[PDB]
């Protein structure tokens, strides 16, 4: 899960 | 003719006798006679042993346990205190391990976005964060929503709680903010990072607490945790709380683990660095993994460092000189999660596999695999239990019998974002039909  | 051996033997000898009995037998004995009751309630060892046998406390955590029990029960004695604690604990564990026992479920609204990015669970507070740039606080006792904290101009992605209702956050908004649940506002706004705050931790050294934030700017800024409220500090130099930046990584600082004046960071440059926050200098550079690190743990007790990389391996390092100790190979996919239980080192991978290694020698203790081979999204562990979640799966495992206790408790969940548990309360941030929710499970 990576941040935009 | 008979003889009350217990009363007649010397105190010490009778106690050895009781140490050879399972707790149940000890409780019945407590009702055999006034003298038996007196002899048993006179012992602190009796219960200290049990508590440890059942893994409700460890030698290191003992004393603190006592202090907390004394604050809880002033008019009780150490003996009776420990016994109350054990009886209360052994029955919650009984419920957890009972296949025929079903927890009470409470479901609360989550964030505006279906994905939760982070979750803390301390002091009867369940705090959750999301890419909807919001922070939700909940009450774990009355099982309900308390308030929401707004401020970040970007989705929140890292949040750590700090005793007193104070909590720190980090977001794509590139800021590090400190909040006060009590007041329900953002009391500080620390700017500096030239990119998204990806991770953070709080360590304490010489009664001083420090905040350590890793970023996609390749650095780790260090700030001291503070003792009209939205106090913004556009500049680090002028920010009293700023301490400095730890430069060394050539890529995003993906994970961070610390304790005292020692912090360890994992980057995407496939490396890890051990920093001495106090001297604000690089101590060791752990190299060897052939791909990005997604998780590291600083085992202060043993003075070591565990690392989990996308190269599918786990590495144990000796922080007494920085050289590699062992390389664990029990995953065929990216290893992004790690936890250090008093008794286990647990790791989960993108292939749905979960492994438990002895916390000291790393011999294979247990291994689980989610049936639908989906990537392990989250999990939590204690010496007695393991809770893991992945798409369409939420499992509870009894680490003693190694068997799966419950597998359908949160069946209607589509994603288990974050799971955390402590005592008789289990919590999970999940996704159901394109929406997030907070799940609270009761085992008391």
């Amino acid at each position: 899960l990576t941040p935009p | 003719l008979k003889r009350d051996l217990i009363t007649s033997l010397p105190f010490e000898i009778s106690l050895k006798i009781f140490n050879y009995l399972q707790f149940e037998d000890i409780i019945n004995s407590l009702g055999v006679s006034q003298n038996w009751n007196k002899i048993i309630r006179k012992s602190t060892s009796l219960w200290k042993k049990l508590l440890i046998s059942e893994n409700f406390v460890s030698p290191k955590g003992f004393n603190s346990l006592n202090l907390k029990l004394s604050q809880k029960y002033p008019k009780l004695s150490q003996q009776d205190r420990l016994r109350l604690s054990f009886l209360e604990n052994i029955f919650i564990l009984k419920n957890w391990y009972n296949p025929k026992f079903v927890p009470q479920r409470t479901t609360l609204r989550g964030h505006m976005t279906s994905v939760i990015t982070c979750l803390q669970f301390e002091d009867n507070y369940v705090i959750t964060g999301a890419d909807d740039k919001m922070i939700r606080v909940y009450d774990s006792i009355n099982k309900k929503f308390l308030l929401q904290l707004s401020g970040h101009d970007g989705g929140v992605w890292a949040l750590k709680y700090a005793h007193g209702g104070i909590l720190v956050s980090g977001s794509t908004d590139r800021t590090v903010r400190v909040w006060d649940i009590k007041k329900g506002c953002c009391t500080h706004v620390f700017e500096g990072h030239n990119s998204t705050v990806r991770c953070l931790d709080i360590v304490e050294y010489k009664n001083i607490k420090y905040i350590v934030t890793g970023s996609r700017d390749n650095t780790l800024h260090v700030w001291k945790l503070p003792k009209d409220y939205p106090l913004v500090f556009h500049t680090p130099e002028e920010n009293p709380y700023f301490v400095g930046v730890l430069r060394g990584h050539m890529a995003s600082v993906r994970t961070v683990s610390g304790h005292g004046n020692i912090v360890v960071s994992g980057s995407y440059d496939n490396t890890l660095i051990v920093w001495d926050v106090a001297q604000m200098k690089c101590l060791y550079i752990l190299s060897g993994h052939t791909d990005r690190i997604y998780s590291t743990i600083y085992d202060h007790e043993r003075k070591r460092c565990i690392s989990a990389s996308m190269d599918t391996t786990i590495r144990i390092w000796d922080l007494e000189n920085g050289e590699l100790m062992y390389t664990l190979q029990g995953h065929t996919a990216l290893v992004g999660l790690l936890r250090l239980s008093d008794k286990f080192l647990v790791s989960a991978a993108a292939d749905g596999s979960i492994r438990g290694w002895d916390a000291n020698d790393y011999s294979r203790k247990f291994s689980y695999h989610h049936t639908n081979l989906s990537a392990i999204t989250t999990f939590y562990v204690s010496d007695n239990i393991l809770v893991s979640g992945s798409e369409n799966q939420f499992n509870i495992y009894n680490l003693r019998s190694g068997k799966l206790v419950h597998a359908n408790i949160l069946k209607d969940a589509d994603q288990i974002w974050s799971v955390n548990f402590k005592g008789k309360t289990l919590v999970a941030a999940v996704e159901k039909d394109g929406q997030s929710f907070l799940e609270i499970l009761d085992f008391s």
Partner: protein
């Protein structure tokens, strides 16, 4: 080489010094040692256990189980003797057997077992589960 143990009833028991050394008390004594206030029958019983365990190593036992299958008085004195003679293995054996008499038993069951008296007033009783 032999050693001689005298029971509290004046009886002399000859036994191998090496085997006798099971008793740390005898061991530290560093040829005739007294065993004050220990019944002959008890001491004899202790010696038998020491000779039988001449080549055993200690950091439940099937034989000990039978050996201790004696009356409550006896068991009590054997544990005491063991304790006085400082023979840890034997003491533990004796303690394990007594715990085994309690194991899985109820307050009433246990009371009968030792013929103990229930001195809990009706009230104190209820307040105990």
């Amino acid at each position: 080489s032999n050693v001689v143990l005298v029971s509290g009833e004046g009886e002399r028991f000859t036994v191998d010094k090496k085997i006798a050394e099971r008793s740390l008390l005898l061991k530290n004594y560093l040829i005739v040692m007294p065993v004050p206030n220990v019944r002959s029958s008890v001491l004899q019983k202790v010696i038998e256990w020491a000779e039988h365990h001449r080549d055993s190593n200690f950091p439940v036992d099937s034989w000990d189980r039978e050996f201790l299958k004696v009356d409550q008085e006896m068991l009590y004195e054997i544990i005491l003797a063991a304790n006085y003679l400082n023979i840890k293995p034997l003491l533990d054996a004796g303690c394990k057997v007594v715990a085994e008499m309690i194991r899985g038993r109820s307050p009433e069951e246990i009371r009968r077992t030792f013929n103990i008296v229930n001195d809990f007033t009706p009230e104190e009783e209820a307040a105990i589960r």
